[PDB]
Amino acid sequence: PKQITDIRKFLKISRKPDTTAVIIMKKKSKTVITKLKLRTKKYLYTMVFADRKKAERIENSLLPSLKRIYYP
Amino acid sequence: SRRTKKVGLTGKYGTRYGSSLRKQIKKIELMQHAKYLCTFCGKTATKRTCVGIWKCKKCKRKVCGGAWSLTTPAAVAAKSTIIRL
Amino acid sequence: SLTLQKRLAASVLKCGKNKIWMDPNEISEISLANSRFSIRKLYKEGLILKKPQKVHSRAR
Amino acid sequence: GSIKRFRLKQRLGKCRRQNRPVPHWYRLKNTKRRHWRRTKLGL
Amino acid sequence: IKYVLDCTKPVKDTILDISGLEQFFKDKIKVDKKTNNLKNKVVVTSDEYKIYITVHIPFSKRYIKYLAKKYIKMHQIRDFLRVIAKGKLAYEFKYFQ
RNA sequence: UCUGAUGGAGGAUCGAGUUGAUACUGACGUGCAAAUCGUUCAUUUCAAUCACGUUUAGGGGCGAAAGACUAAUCGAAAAG
RNA sequence: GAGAACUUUGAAGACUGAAGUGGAGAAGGGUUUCUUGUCAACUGUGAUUGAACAAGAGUUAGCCGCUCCUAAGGGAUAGCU
RNA sequence: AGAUGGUAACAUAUAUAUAAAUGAACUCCUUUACAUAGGCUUUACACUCGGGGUGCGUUUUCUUUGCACUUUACCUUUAUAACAAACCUUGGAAUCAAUUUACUUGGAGAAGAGGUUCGUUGAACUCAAUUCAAAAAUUUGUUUUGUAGCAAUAGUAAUUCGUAAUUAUCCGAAGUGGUAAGGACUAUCCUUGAAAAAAGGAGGGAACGGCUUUGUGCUUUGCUACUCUUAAUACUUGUAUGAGCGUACCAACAACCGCAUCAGGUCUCCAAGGUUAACAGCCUCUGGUUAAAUAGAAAAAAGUAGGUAAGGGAAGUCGGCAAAAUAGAUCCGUAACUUCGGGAAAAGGAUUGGCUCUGAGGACAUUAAUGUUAACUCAGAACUGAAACGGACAAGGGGA
Ligand SMILES: [Mg+2]
Ligand SMILES: [Mg+2]
Ligand SMILES: [Mg+2]
Ligand SMILES: [Mg+2]
Ligand SMILES: [Mg+2]
Ligand SMILES: [Mg+2]
Ligand SMILES: [Mg+2]
Ligand SMILES: [Mg+2]
Ligand SMILES: [Mg+2]
Ligand SMILES: [Mg+2]
Ligand SMILES: [Mg+2]
Ligand SMILES: [Mg+2]
Ligand SMILES: [Mg+2]
Ligand SMILES: [Mg+2]
Ligand SMILES: [Mg+2]
Ligand SMILES: [Mg+2]
Ligand SMILES: [Mg+2]
Ligand SMILES: [Mg+2]
Ligand SMILES: [Mg+2]
Ligand SMILES: [Mg+2]
Ligand SMILES: [Mg+2]
Ligand SMILES: [Mg+2]
Ligand SMILES: [Mg+2]
Ligand SMILES: [Mg+2]
Ligand SMILES: [Mg+2]
Ligand SMILES: [Mg+2]
Ligand SMILES: [Mg+2]
Ligand SMILES: [Mg+2]
């Protein structure tokens, strides 16, 4: 499992066709934190956002053939 | 306080083994556990590894030599003769 | 013969047999539980309980 | 123990099979039993 | 900093007398190991169904619960009642089932 | 050449365990046991102990030697 | 349950006392595991219990092992006896 | 036809993924790959302490209380940090210096100053992100997140609601040093403590673009996308991904060996609290049993495993056999003799509880004084008791 910090890199990864599923998790922080996981054939890449709206926007951006798993 | 009068290195042996034997050991143990002068680096660091093998800590040059001393007399004599020749 | 049930409870709960309290009222109900699922159900109900750990106080 | 050769395992299985009693229906048309504790297979 | 006791359920069955409880709390609550203080450091007031404890000093919710338990023991209400946490600041009496 | 520290040598010291088996010539001796039990005892950084693997086979082996041991069998195993 | 000192459950009182009748494995055992039955014998007292008896079931690996390497060693090839 | 950086130690490919830094014959190394002892240190685990949160327990009296839970895996060359080493640059050391618990080290270059690497470790560090603001061709300041990802969705303890779902929790300091591992060392040896498969590195410089045309794999002539490199995809070639075997259970207490459900024997790891030097012994928590080829009643002799005994104290007996006494620690004192090492715990004395105090022993960080704060150990003094205190357990009898 890997972490991602460059949003652009994440986007690129998403664009790449072996990325079957996205996992999008909501977490009550000690505000609503959001973890964006992409499930690639090789690795499970995750991005952490402090900011909900940004997270939402990025989710929206994600290709609509991704197999989105809303965990909690 | 200097602990042992006569014994020195053979205190490890304690009461056991003849006094004569311990006396003999003493010479040889002194010879063994001395740091000898290394003929290459100069430093008195050649201590004994195995029996006939003497490693300088400084330069790491293993000199073959005596079992107890670094140089036996016979060997030295031989060397001298060769040099003369 | 509640042996079996006790054993199952031990695993399910994570406790030693020495620690399972099977209610002497409704020994009939419990004996009917031949499964881990049933034991869990029983536990949920309160026909099986993990006993309280014997106390070892550091106080003294 | 818990690591047998295949051959040994097969032999064990065979022995177990041998152990079981006469099928009762036959009796209408055994002395070689062995109990695991008292008589060994001596493998 | 407020800590609360939602005393309703047994108060509305008469079994809990809030005035007595308040007094007990006042008596009990040690500050640096002495009961009689409660000066600028601690306050206790009471609604009909609720005790309010307001604290400046390092003070644990555990202590309140303990006090409640003690009170219950004193007035024999132990097999009927139970102190349980509602919100972080808020303890509440609940009936044993 | 003394004094105080340091240092941590030794088939050193005591000692649980382990490995044994000194005494009680205790118990047992138609036993729990074809050698056990109890308490006492010796052993514990080395010639130490243990496991597994491996070598050595009968007038042969192996023996810090007791004619010990060599599958309850030994001043010559066992099987036929 | 026909029947209970030694089957089960609960309540006591105790012991083992992390050099353990605790958890894991090796050798050895070989199904003793497991459920449902169950009592002729056996379980040196009883027994409804059981490691007994009967019927069924149960052991899932690219990663844990073996499998490969070499060790003390062994069996052979060439010869030679 | 085969990258660059860095004075150097050496570093650099961050593409989904550090894949790619030409290399043949033939060589040479290294890894694999190693004893025992001794302490020192580092980390994890365990244990503990104090605080916050949850529940249960105690409550005649007392107790801000006693107990439980408060979790975090491989994997990501994990990124970084810190640290023992090793090396590099600079620097030029006797008034020797640095330095370890120990000694080690230095003109063959020390200290100091700045670096590089491996190794521990595996989120330490502002580590990463983001917040916005200022300076160059990107670095500084402030804030908010993230149990760094794995990861909370899982566990745990709760709380409800239903006949599976919701909620709230999961976190701020530290000590002890039992176990393990690593490190750097030091010491002992007439003892110097396996090998190979496999892998790697180096040395070396064999061989060298592609397509089209001509002549007998080689030579000549003309043109410029080439040589690698991972990943995917397609297509023919036998069907182009993971073979086989073991995995139940016992491991002695009734599954093993002792003719048996035999007080015997049988290898390895884990290993809690208290008392303590102690993994001893005694007691306790987790886990385990409450069983053992019998139970009950009586309670004589005799037996066996124990106790105790006035006065004497070996008179017993082959013989102090057996038992008793002795014992832990601290302080004192310690002879003959001696191979000068020992003897030696010689012999022989004293003290030891509980309580209430006193003194001695660190770390850090403000600016010599003032702070926050930690073990556990030592030493001394009061009082105290039916003069007792290594109160049980454990633990030399000594001498000639
Ligand atoms: Mg076998
Ligand atoms: Mg047998
Ligand atoms: Mg004898
Ligand atoms: Mg006898
Ligand atoms: Mg007799
Ligand atoms: Mg024999
Ligand atoms: Mg019986
Ligand atoms: Mg006990
Ligand atoms: Mg006992
Ligand atoms: Mg069974
Ligand atoms: Mg019987
Ligand atoms: Mg059965
Ligand atoms: Mg059977
Ligand atoms: Mg493997
Ligand atoms: Mg081969
Ligand atoms: Mg060989
Ligand atoms: Mg041959
Ligand atoms: Mg959860
Ligand atoms: Mg198993
Ligand atoms: Mg037995
Ligand atoms: Mg036999
Ligand atoms: Mg068990
Ligand atoms: Mg028995
Ligand atoms: Mg007398
Ligand atoms: Mg006398
Ligand atoms: Mg007489
Ligand atoms: Mg006499
Ligand atoms: Mg005696």
Cα D6 to averaged position of ligand 17 atoms, centre (Å): 30
Question: How many Å lie between the centroid of ligand 26 and the Cα of residue D23?
Answer: 84
All chains having 3 or more CB pairs closer than 8 angstroms to chain E: none
Is the CB of B14 less than 7 A from some atom of nucleic acid strand F?
A: yes
Subunits close to A (at least 3 CB pairs below 8 A): none
- Pair type for strands E2-6 and E50-55: antiparallel
Neighbours of A43 (CB within 10 A): 11
- E strands, chain E, are 2-6, 42-46, 50-55, 83-87, 90-93
CA at A11, C1' at H390: how many angstroms apart?
A: 76
Nucleic strand H under 7 Å from the C-beta of A41: yes
Torsion (CA) C20, C21, C27, C32 in degrees, nearest 10:
-30
Distance between CA atoms of residues A66 and E67, nearest Å: 57
Q: Solving technique for this entry?
A: cryo-EM
Report phi then psi at A49, rounded to 5.
Answer: -110, 130
Are C33 and C42 in contact by the 8 Å Cβ rule? The answer is yes
- Find out whether C47 and C26 touch, Cβ atoms under 8 Å: yes
Q: Please check whether strand F approaches the CB of B4 to within 7 Å.
A: no
